[PDB]
């Protein structure tokens, strides 16, 4: 947590239908957007903090 990896993800095709067939993903809370309907929006560059 004190060295959280921040990966800049750009020039991608964000397919959010691949993280649900994996292990049970809990607490999928999106602040500002809906959990679904994310496959129709074009973002400029996202950041993944793991």
């Amino acid at each position: 947590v004190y060295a959280w990896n921040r990966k800049r993800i750009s020039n991608c095709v964000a397919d959010y239908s691949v993280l649900y067939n994996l292990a049970p993903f809990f607490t999928f809370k999106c602040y500002g957007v809906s959990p679904t309907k994310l496959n129709d929006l074009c973002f400029t560059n996202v950041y993944a903090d793991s």
Binding site: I9, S10, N11, C12, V13, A14, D15, Y16, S17, G32, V33, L38, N39, D40, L41, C42, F43, T44, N45, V46, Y47, A48, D49, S50
Partner: protein
């Protein structure tokens, strides 16, 4: 492994999005179609429906 669920490790990824005036590069899995002009249709551009 024998501790309660409140103390078990949980991996967490935070996906921070951005929306500014620039050509977008991260879209969703939607196959784009051809451009048919001079006809009232439903446009579905990057962020304008």
């Amino acid at each position: 492994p024998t501790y309660g669920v409140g103390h078990q490790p949980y991996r967490v990824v935070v996906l921070s999005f951005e929306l500014l005036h620039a050509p977008a590069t991260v879209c969703g899995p939607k196959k784009s179609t051809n451009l048919v002009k001079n006809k009232c249709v439903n446009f579905n551009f990057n962020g304008l429906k």
